[PDB]
Design a protein around this ligand. Structure first.
Ligand SMILES: *[C@@H]1O[C@H](CO)[C@@H](O[C@@H]2O[C@H](CO)[C@@H](O[C@@H]3O[C@H](CO)[C@@H](O)[C@H](O)[C@@H]3O)[C@H](O)[C@H]2NC(C)=O)[C@H](O)[C@H]1NC(C)=O
Ligand SMILES: *[C@@H]1O[C@H](CO)[C@@H](O[C@@H]2O[C@H](CO)[C@@H](O[C@@H]3O[C@H](CO)[C@@H](O)[C@H](O)[C@@H]3O)[C@H](O)[C@H]2NC(C)=O)[C@H](O)[C@H]1NC(C)=O
Ligand SMILES: *[C@@H]1O[C@H](CO)[C@@H](O)[C@H](O)[C@H]1NC(C)=O
Ligand SMILES: *[C@@H]1O[C@H](CO)[C@@H](O)[C@H](O)[C@H]1NC(C)=O
Ligand SMILES: *[C@@H]1O[C@H](CO)[C@@H](O)[C@H](O)[C@H]1NC(C)=O
Ligand SMILES: *[C@@H]1O[C@H](CO)[C@@H](O)[C@H](O)[C@H]1NC(C)=O
Ligand SMILES: *[C@@H]1O[C@H](CO)[C@@H](O)[C@H](O)[C@H]1NC(C)=O
Ligand SMILES: *[C@@H]1O[C@H](CO)[C@@H](O)[C@H](O)[C@H]1NC(C)=O
Ligand SMILES: *[C@@H]1O[C@H](CO)[C@@H](O)[C@H](O)[C@H]1NC(C)=O
Ligand SMILES: *[C@@H]1O[C@H](CO)[C@@H](O)[C@H](O)[C@H]1NC(C)=O
Ligand SMILES: *[C@@H]1O[C@H](CO)[C@@H](O)[C@H](O)[C@H]1NC(C)=O
Ligand SMILES: *[C@@H]1O[C@H](CO)[C@@H](O)[C@H](O)[C@H]1NC(C)=O
Ligand SMILES: *[C@@H]1O[C@H](CO)[C@@H](O)[C@H](O)[C@H]1NC(C)=O
Ligand SMILES: *[C@@H]1O[C@H](CO)[C@@H](O)[C@H](O)[C@H]1NC(C)=O
Ligand SMILES: [Zn+2]
Ligand SMILES: [Zn+2]
Lengths: 892, 892
């Protein structure tokens, strides 16, 4: 009941501005520690009389000044009380300054601090990243503040609605460049006590959130170009990468995307520059720090001679995502983390608009169906999912915050925005967004603020909707999950219900909306688009959905809406007949839909599993990427359920049959692998045909990959494998080979100069079929001299995806949990095969054994794993015989 | 405290003779059950007045007669009390007849019973075995009584010291032959109620134990020959096997071995015939029933065109073993099961004398070192081992009895007899045994009775020993374990201590002998045998064991003694120098000894592990079977400890290097696999070279086995693989191949006509590297339509030996224990890889979870698994780095 034991800051104090001086030491001290020393003054306003200053502080040591950890001074004549004592409260991460009296309402004060922290290799706060240039160790001081680590670099009111201006000074070796959000204010000057160091002050930032600050000291090089909106773009990276031209693609796209967004939203980018910088050690994909956007090397750099088309797509989309955040996150910021989707849903959707602008021939916007809609529907069909906007009172700790950086906030966020754009029209949507951005510039928002501005646009344009934007969109935002819409084409009746993969699962989170949605329904009849419809009730009838004779209908054209569709068996049969007659008559995205929806419906007991399997029969003559990818994504579940069972042979036999003609088509079309297709989707289709053919035993594919890899081994400096094919050739050559192939690939990995090439090798090494080799590799993932800490969990996950790595990794996780934790994606990956009572009991015991240690940001993933495991046991029992028989009877 | 709740029969009643009539029904009844109906009268003597008749009865249903389950009558004027009531007490397996008064001391009585039981497919008591002749189902009624199942066929005083004569009548279909211990008494007559059945009475048996009775009804055929001692031998088997000539080898050897034993022990076989019969369904290897010896088909039948030399050796040794029992077990019988070694140790040793007689060119007696001494030293180095003669009061239940049919009773029994023969001389030994057999014919013995007769021979021959036979041999019989004898060749000092694989293990069983032995020590100096020595104390000094200059000594010539030997490092170094200079200077058995002892000493921390590994270096030029087999046996532990670890590659690389020249030698010597070596040991050496080369990655071996198997697949009716090579070619071709090879081998298995061929295929199928295939195969082992119940556990063990089958089988055992148990070798096999705290905790939880179900005859194996797992964790921690480095540095 003491304020310093509660996780949210009091509302009594609100900062105005800060100055911060930080000095990283890039050589270890006598104790072998890398440290930084700093000072700060924060000016703040008392909003309500209080005798305590509660401010965030994490892993900082204070130098005493005038008898206490801090000094408190008046501003504009205020006369603050004396300090009694200070304390550091570790759980809530506060410095608590107990005062001898109360501060005065609507008065200002300043607090000065002098402090020191570790420049750790922990990827959080002010931290160190390392690389080698030949035999010379290069050490970089860099930052990652989001969500709650700005407090690990200096004391601050570290919540996103506590916006302030920041005056940053970096003291650094004179040979190294200091970078921050803003440009330097005047020249750098020698430090008086030691002229081997420079003092670099930066101009004051705009009013902004603490989680967006960045401080970097390095000897990076850069390329640069003024963008057409007058903003300076620089791409910074290790000197060898810049000299090799690997920053050139980022330079080609960054300024043009930034200018595109500024124009599209009628809202200028207000800062003089936007630096993009690639770090050797970085936790997430990238981070949108305002003026100094940071990236993993693999998300920013690109080598036209060794990076794949998929890598190129990653670069432009991640850049577009980070640039989208300059508007959705930086200029306008979430009030609190519970509404994270206002940042992340927007950036995840808007990234495709930016990438499409930069690369108009690629057709990327379409991939959102796979990358966003279907990615998130897997978890959002669980009773243990969570709403897009969780109630703010439930999100308090750093672990609970971290947990929200998930498929819901990103991918469901993007999907619901895609749907909204569709029913408003994009022109009306962007009009409402321009108004939103203008109104809340330099401020913070909740979900209701967005609806108000979209409503203003709807009202201006006289768009008629069945109710207000707020009431439609609250259904998609405040309750978890999504509906299945079931059509009876005999009568034209539609109904909706909350779609649950397990009908038996226990939804315990109440919804004031009763898990009923207001649903925009598009549709086609025999390939022709019909009038749009709004389903407002649990059930309705309309002749739009009635058919007679040979006619079929499909709902959700191009899957713009966040919902699944079921039909009566007769309409499904007509759809299957269409797929056999001329599959091109159904839009490509809807061919993906038919497959993906039917597999999920089968899990939920809404269609027979043989109906979903029958929907894959036409794939033998499908050449498009997307329907194959949707099928392989759904069948991934079958592999997880069955790859340790009698069902697996027939399953592989079936996939071998379905993919062989496609594999042969590509063998011929590429002139025996000499060329790659012109169209991006065809390039992806080719990779999937190869991967699928090889995984399922097509002998020509096994011969091809082993032959190519052997040719590379014989000529290591002349890699004969096209970059697009490397991941799959490397993985399958390692799977088909033995110790000699593995060791070759490991040495290539250790000696890698490109992160893209290292990443492909690192995944490939997990493809060994030999248990002893997987165990040895597991031991390397934990050694930061061998595999970078940023990549440890990724590599462990690659091992667990291998059927032979399953028991290995699960036993390792159970055995080492305390050590791993104390010193989410992992839980999800290691548990997804579970389909037995034995495994369930292990998982329940794992929860019990580690309840005290806690599961931190993996807490919800554990609940979800328990729910899925229970569903899987029942699903396997119900389906194993029918599935075995189906694959056996259809694979010949 | 009621006698009927105690496991041992009272001493109040002792049977004299029995008549038993049994009638099996070889077609199912209306309820689908196969049943047998029977009657019995037992005549018994009251030794002490009692008002209860406690007699064994298991799974029998009684037909009421004169108002009770049985009728009690007087003999020779006795006048028994009326019966009050009877009860069946299931735990102790008794029929309990409560009387209205007491029986009279030294009077006789008769008890009549009429009963019915199931002719189950459970391999115990009177049971059914099944085979197909074309499409016609053949059903056989057959028996297995040992230890405690005679009571499952008729009520009896079912303990081995309750000897009696038996008068057996079988009522059977007129077309089927009835067989029992004795020959028929007069002609068979039609059953009056139904002339489709014959009534066959057999002559009275000698006085004998209930566990030796046999009753068989079949349409088997036979071959026959009168043996030179006038005894009729017949070999009986399914008609197709006999017609094919597959009983001919057994006929060649059986009579001659029987006559050899009768001559050797100066003790005639007293019965008119000895039938050998091979059953399609049979639990153990064979069973020595007096006059009607039963066998698995794979232990009796032999096909010169498809069976291997190893199979041939199995046939002659198992026949010799069963014939040895006619003297050691049947004529003279253990008093109680605690002294089982008096039957099984003798048969296990004497089998080699008989087999050597029949096949004098094979040199089999030598293999006892591998098959007996080293087989048992593994378990007898645990604190949880047990003495050869366990105290009788500890052995009470059928589970505790069953448990004693183990490596101690068989192999340690044989080893201690080998040692005894060596120090007495065989001539003195057999003189004492002839006296033993003469004195105790038709009676029962304990271990002390044997020593008394051996002493009589020693006394007659004036053999001088350091004490009596009893006092020497009690050290080897009444306490578990064996000594390590450590020699300091600097001073000629020897000492002994109880050898424990884990120095930290807790020996809780006290020994009145303080784990000190009296040890006969043979020795050689530079290849020349020295005078024998007796170590009587914990330590001694003698110049026999002192060396100077270049001389070396070795103790335990040809490993006649049941002990391990360690030396000072200097003598070990001279031994290693001898192995490098001219390994032929050390007797072949002692080359096996040097290897095997050093590996075990290394586990016990008595020598560095690198010393044991260094002792294998000379194997690169070793061509003899035995030292290689001893090395591979010891290295099996390294494989179990390391085949899921980084150590395994270097280990395989080392074995590949060591075996390649031998593999190439055989490739050349056999004219590229066209021929097999003439000498039996060389034939075994060839198989081991192939197995080892293929398991460890010799490319010429992988090519050879895959090529041969493919050639067979292309010509299924013309198998190109020599029988000696089939097990290893089949296993490695399956491991190297995929689903197509596996499926070919499975269909060959299902269609097999020879048990020998089926057995090789059944083992080979467990060699798949694909987890899904092993899981599918696991599901077949449990289906009695696919794999015979007699072979279920064997096949499961083959799966668990595969590194990929480890997690599979262990999880299966944990998950299905209650079901498996309620509806020992398995425990030992599934746990032998355990070397981690994680696995230990699983094992401890497994014990806890199933404590109530109990572990029956697997109880001691579980205690041993716990002890070994704890030792393994420590051993891996202590040795993994040094072993990794050694294999890496020595494999190049
Ligand atoms: C971070 O740097 C900025 C920019 O230099 C500082 O803002 C400046 O602060 C000064 C001193 O407070 C402002 O002048 C004063 O304004 C007050 C009204 O609040 C007036 O009563 C005084 O007479 C005086 O003129 C100045 O306007 C302001 N400049 C800008 C552009 O806003 C800021 O204080 C720095 N913060 C910290 C903690 O160092
Ligand atoms: C199993 O069969 C044997 C052999 O037929 C039976 O042994 C025979 O039993 C009879 C009747 O007891 C013996 O004759 C009797 O001997 C007693 C002395 O105990 C004497 O007082 C009577 O005057 C009478 O002669 C006969 O000697 C004996 N034969 C042999 C060779 O031992 C045995 O009884 C049968 N057991 C059962 C339970 O059916
Ligand atoms: C902060 O102080 C603690 C406690 O004295 C010390 O262990 C730690 O090393 C200090 N951190 C730094 C970066 O100096
Ligand atoms: C360091 O300061 C000097 C002036 O004192 C300036 O010329 C130089 O460019 C600065 N260098 C860096 C890397 O900040
Ligand atoms: C960047 O654009 C230039 C000019 O259009 C082009 O030549 C170059 O290939 C582009 N670089 C990359 C890496 O795509
Ligand atoms: C709506 O129209 C009003 C009045 O013309 C205008 O001022 C306002 O900016 C418009 N809002 C939106 C969201 O278009
Ligand atoms: C799947 O197709 C088969 C073969 O045409 C058909 O018999 C079966 O009914 C289909 N399954 C369903 C659920 O319609
Ligand atoms: C490792 O990479 C270096 C530098 O990029 C290259 O020169 C060399 O060929 C590679 N080393 C090996 C052993 O292949
Ligand atoms: C013995 O009786 C029990 C109980 O009535 C019955 O279940 C069982 O089938 C009987 N056994 C035989 C072989 O008839
Ligand atoms: C059955 O009995 C008859 C005499 O009744 C006899 O001739 C025949 O050999 C007997 N057969 C068998 C198999 O016991
Ligand atoms: C049995 O002995 C005969 C005669 O010596 C011999 O010809 C035959 O090969 C032997 N049979 C077997 C199966 O060894
Ligand atoms: C020992 O000798 C006695 C007297 O000659 C003889 O009767 C007895 O059978 C012999 N015993 C043994 C075991 O040789
Ligand atoms: C094993 O042999 C190596 C190489 O000759 C030697 O250095 C080492 O001492 C030996 N190990 C032992 C325990 O003697
Ligand atoms: C199975 O064995 C039979 C009878 O021994 C043989 O005739 C036939 O060739 C085998 N069947 C197959 C399919 O190989
Ligand atoms: Zn983002
Ligand atoms: Zn035996």
């Amino acid at each position: 009941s003491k304020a310093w034991n509660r996780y949210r800051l009091p509302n009594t104090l609100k900062p105005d501005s800060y100055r911060v001086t930080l000095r990283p030491y890039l050589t270890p001290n006598d104790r072998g520690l890398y440290v930084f020393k700093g000072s700060s003054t924060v000016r703040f306003t008392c909003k309500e009389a209080t005798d305590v200053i509660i401010i965030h502080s994490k892993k900082l040591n204070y130098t005493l000044s005038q008898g206490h950890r801090v000094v408190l001074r008046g501003v504009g004549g205020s006369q603050p009380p004396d300090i009694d004592k200070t304390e550091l409260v570790e759980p809530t991460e506060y410095l608590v300054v107990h005062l001898k009296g109360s501060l005065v309402k609507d008065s200002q004060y300043e607090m000065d601090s002098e402090f020191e922290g570790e420049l750790a290799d922990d990827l959080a706060g002010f931290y160190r990243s390392e690389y080698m240039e030949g035999n010379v160790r290069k050490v970089v001081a860099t930052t990652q503040m989001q969500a709650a680590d700005a407090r690990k670099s200096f004391p601050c009111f570290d919540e996103p609605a506590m916006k302030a201006e920041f005056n940053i000074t970096l003291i650094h070796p004179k040979d190294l460049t200091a970078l921050s959000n803003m440009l330097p204010k005047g020249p750098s000057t020698p430090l008086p006590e030691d002229p081997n160091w420079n003092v670099t002050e930066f101009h004051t930032t705009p009013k902004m959130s603490t989680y967006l600050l960045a401080f970097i000291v390095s000897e990076f090089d850069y390329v640069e170009k003024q963008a057409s909106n007058g903003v300076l773009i620089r791409i910074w990276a290790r000197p060898s990468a810049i000299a090799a031209g690997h920053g050139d693609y980022a330079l080609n796209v960054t300024g043009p995307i930034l200018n595109f967004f500024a124009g599209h939203y009628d809202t200028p980018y207000p800062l003089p520059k936007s630096d993009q910088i690639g770090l050797p050690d970085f936790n997430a994909g990238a981070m949108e720090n305002w003026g100094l956007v940071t990236y993993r090397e693999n998300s920013l750099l690109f080598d036209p001679l060794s990076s794949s088309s998929s890598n190129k797509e990653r670069v432009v989309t991640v850049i577009a995502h980070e640039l989208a955040h300059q508007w959705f996150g930086n200029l306008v910021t979430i009030e609190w983390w519970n509404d994270l989707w206002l940042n992340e849903g927007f950036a995840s959707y808007v990234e495709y608009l930016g990438a499409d602008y930069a690369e108009p021939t690629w057709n990327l916007k379409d991939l959102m169906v796979l990358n966003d809609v279907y990615r998130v529907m897997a978890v959002d069909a669980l009773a243990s999912s969570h709403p897009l906007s969780t109630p703010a009172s439930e999100i308090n700790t750093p672990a609970q915050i971290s947990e929200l950086f998930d498929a819901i906030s990103y991918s469901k966020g993007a999907s619901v925005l895609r749907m909204l754009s569709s029913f408003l029209s994009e022109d009306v949507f962007k009009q409402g967004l321009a108004s939103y951005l203008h109104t809340f510039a330099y401020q913070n928002t909740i979900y209701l603020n967005l609806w108000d501005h979209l409503q203003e646009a709807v009202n201006n344009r006289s768009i008629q909707l069945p109710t207000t934007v707020r009431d439609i969109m609250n259904r998609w935002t405040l309750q978890m999950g999504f509906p299945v819409i079931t059509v009876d084409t005999s009568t034209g009746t539609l109904s909706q219900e909350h779609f649950l993969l397990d009908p038996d699962s226990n939804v315990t989170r109440p919804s004031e909306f009763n898990y009923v949605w207001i649903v925009p329904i598009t549709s086609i009849r025999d390939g022709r688009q019909q009038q749009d419809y709004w389903l407002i009730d649990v059930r309705a009838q309309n002749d739009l959905f009635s058919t007679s004779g040979n006619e079929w209908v499909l709902l959700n054209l191009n899957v713009t809406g966040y919902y699944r569709v079921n039909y009566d068996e007769e309409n499904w049969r007509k759809i299957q007949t269409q797929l056999q007659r001329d599959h091109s008559a159904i839009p490509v995205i809807n061919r993906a839909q038919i497959i993906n929806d039917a597999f999920n419906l089968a899990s939920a007991h809404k269609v027979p599993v043989t109906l979903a399997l029958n929907n894959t029969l036409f794939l033998i003559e499908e050449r498009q990427y997307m329907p194959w990818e949707a099928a392989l994504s759904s069948l991934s579940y079958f592999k997880l359920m069955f790859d340790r069972s009698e069902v697996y042979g027939p399953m592989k036999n079936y996939l071998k049959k379905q993919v062989t003609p496609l594999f042969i088509h590509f063998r011929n079309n590429t002139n025996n692998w000499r060329e790659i297709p012109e169209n991006l989707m065809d390039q992806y289709s080719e990779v999937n045909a190869i991967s699928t053919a090889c995984s399922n035993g097509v002998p020509e594919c096994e011969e091809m990959v082993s032959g190519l890899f052997k040719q590379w081994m014989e000529n290591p400096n002349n890699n004969p494998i096209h970059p697009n094919l490397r991941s799959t050739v490397y993985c399958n050559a390692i799977a088909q080979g033995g110790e000699e192939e593995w060791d070759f690939a490991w040495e290539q990995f250790r000696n890698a100069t490109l992160v893209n090439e290292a990443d492909k090798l690192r995944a490939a090494l997990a493809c060994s079929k030999e248990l002893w080799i997987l165990n040895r590799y597991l031991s390397y993932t934990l050694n930061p001299d061998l595999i970078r800490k940023q990549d440890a969990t990724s590599t462990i996950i690659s091992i667990t995806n291998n059927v032979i790595g399953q028991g290995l990794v699960w036993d390792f996780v159970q055995s080492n949990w305390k050590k791993l934790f104390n010193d989410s994606n992992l839980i999800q990956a290691v548990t997804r095969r579970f389909s037995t009572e034995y495994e369930l009991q292990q998982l329940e015991q794992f929860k019990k054994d580690n309840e005290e240690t806690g599961f931190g940001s993996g807490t919800r993933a554990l609940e979800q794993a328990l729910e899925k495991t229970k569903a899987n046991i029942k699903w396997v029992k119900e389906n194993k015989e029918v599935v075995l028989q189906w694959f056996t009877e259809n694979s010949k």
